[model samples]
Target: IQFLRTDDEVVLQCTATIHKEQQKLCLAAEGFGNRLCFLESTSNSKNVPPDLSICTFVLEQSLSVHRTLLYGHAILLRHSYSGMYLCCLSTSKLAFDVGLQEDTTGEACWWTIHPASKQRSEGEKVRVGDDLILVSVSSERYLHLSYGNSSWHVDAAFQQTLWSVAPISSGSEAAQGYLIGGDVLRLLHGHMDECLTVPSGEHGEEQRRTVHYEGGAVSVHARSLWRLETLRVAWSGSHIRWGQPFRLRHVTTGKYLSLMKNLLLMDKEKADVKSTAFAFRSSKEKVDGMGTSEIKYGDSICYIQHVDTGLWLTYQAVDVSIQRKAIMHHEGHMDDGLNLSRSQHEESRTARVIQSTVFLFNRFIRGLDALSKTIDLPIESVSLSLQDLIGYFHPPDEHLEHEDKQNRLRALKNRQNLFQEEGMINLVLECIDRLHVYSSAAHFADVAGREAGESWKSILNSLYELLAALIRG
Candidate 1:
């Protein structure tokens, strides 16, 4: 107050009321920065920290003595593997990078760190309302977003900017933020307000899918679901100190934005190598003319390539239906690898002959006895055992009971079907099997001769065919 600061060394008054400040967190990598703290620059790129000496900022208690922290008391970051601080540069506006630095106390080093509502197994969750630095473990370069450029690169430095990490709120009640590596987050540009989107419904032809940020809302569309995963290795060292590799995955399609073959593209599924892995460094990139750029201005962009081919991934403005062909092949056809043993082959031919004969016999039986119910009796009673044939039919209907007649009629009528009726077909075959004991040849000849008038002859013919078909198969 003016009254309090009247004297050069004004006496201060102490009150019992305790003023509390939000505890700020300082993120430091081993061998990177301890005394070398992050600071904010005055240029458009000042909000994001660079990788070079510019990234080596000292987070002082006051850029001024106001006690008001820069970027809400947020700090810059370094990659465990790259040993570089995340920084931003002016490209008409500001872009993020991880390269040679020039200044340390400028605005480019200052960043706000907002802890997400969720947590990671090994560390804190991805923060919202803050710029981020994504670095590849193998490439050792910062992930860069182009200023509406057709191609995105990793080796460049100008457009390297911090992307805003925002937790898309639950919207419309049904549009709640989905889980990603345990937390719910959506990627955005600190400068551009567009949401991250994945291209869908495309065909082959190396159709480089262009990533779009045209949607007005976050996590409302299919392209916005992303999951962060940790990569573990068998190498002897501490995972925490060096930081584990992280994968950004699209939950719905199960694809990943990975660096393969020097190009950035959405690859199918996950890979074990560092090509698909990235590490997070704190800092955001800024860009101008975001509204008219090929991609939304201030949009954090990275390169992705096809996992199968090393081609760069790009997207077209139009949509196409992608039809995945499911081709199938079958084996063991009659012409392809069909073989039978000698004995088995002979048995197969014999069966075919019997089957043909059964068809003829069944046709004749159906023609002769359309209503006769006694046809099935002989077939069902064709017991091959000598004991069964002994008194199988001593006398028929001479003093038969009502129930016995009904039972016989039921059996004959209940024949399975035209081709399956167990009519008097099997009787002839059974008798032939015992020709030495029953003179079946004479009986068969006699039945055949009287086929025109004798009902038993007709029944015998029908029984012959039915038995042939049933026995052959």
Candidate 2:
């Protein structure tokens, strides 16, 4: 583990690089902060500072880099997980023993700012930048941490096939939990209105709990529900026993399912409807060391699972205002990265331009190699149909479908229509194939190098030469 701290109110830049070498773990760490900065390069000679480095989160507080907490955040980056990432944002006046899980994706990396607090107490164990937040799940299991101090713990006895725990919401003094196993939302001590029941024949006096469900079928004869779909599970002042997870028996597409239900099914259209029994998926794995499954992105739009709340709270990617700001501040460097805002119109323009240029360039560069010997295979042709691709990329916006369709059609006909000519289609297809080859070459080189820049330029230049050939031939 590495540690870093700052006291002069400055920004810190941190980077960690780890790779396998000779079956031994070799790592390099570098960062600069307010009061301290450290960097260690690999060395056979004794001139190197060290293999590990420490940097502060900011000036006043020091930070320790541990595998546990760093790995958690790294997992999010790996999956492009866009949701709330909680960190202890305060030490003064302790708003909560912890901070509320705050939405974090799409924010500027270094610009992330949080408040420093003044709350101090004897034996209160202040989490320093290097303190390891040892989280014990059970007697046999534990998670190590370097930068975090809080965690969720499911009790041993409640650790059955259906039970688990996840901190859905937290503050300085209060933390909320959602139940996991059988007939979930059942309160250990009822305080809310209706404990979610698949009403017995739509009659058994509506029982209430924090988690109330509506959708799914009910049986009058067996006093059991068959299509056990979850509806709504609200937190009614938090008393639903910690560490007790609700077990659901449901399966979909031959896969076992679990607690994270999409809430959209609770809507009027899906009210009281579910397909099969709730059976947990065998592939289901623990999330953050708790009984949970990885929240799928598609499941999010449905609002059927508690993870949906995480999405609900996440920062929207490329928000409207940000788009406007980008446009206003557009510079040459603005076009460097992949465009996240590629609408149908822009995509068409980009594709066409790249296609034409690449074909021209590749034709010119075909003869050039020491590289020719190395160029074993070229690009592949585009597999997807243009119409299908167009439709997929530019589905009609439902908000103004009628109006948007009219505008889109007019624009496409004027600018993008290929005249329905077979000759043009053939040309386009050939260009697409060449472009594909170019892309492959670039991708291969990217793996061989650092960024895709060199490979991209080489492939792009080749394609442009090909396009020139088409024009002159």
66-172, model 2: which lDDT tens digit per residue?
Answer: 12222112111100011122232223221212111233333211111111233422223322232222221112111211122342221112111111111211122
Off by over 4 Å in 2: 1-381, 384-401, 414-473
Q: Give the TM-score of candidate 1.
A: 0.21
Number of the top-ranking candidate, with TM-score as the measure:
1
> Candidate 1, which segments miss by more than 4 Å at Cα?
1-184, 200-212, 215-219, 233-244, 261-270, 284-473
lDDT by residue (tens digit), candidate 1, 1-473: 01100001100011111134321122222121111222212121111111111112222222211122232234443322223344444332233333323344564533443222233221233322334443323232333433245422222243334433222111112111222122223454323344444543232213423344443543233334444443321111111111234455544333555554332345443343445555432211111000111211123233322223333223223345332111111211111110110112222222222223333434444432432323332222122111121212222354778888766444333221211222224534543333223234355444333332333433345434444533342
Candidate 2 structure lDDT = 0.23
Instruction: List the global CA lDDT of all models.
Output: 0.30, 0.23
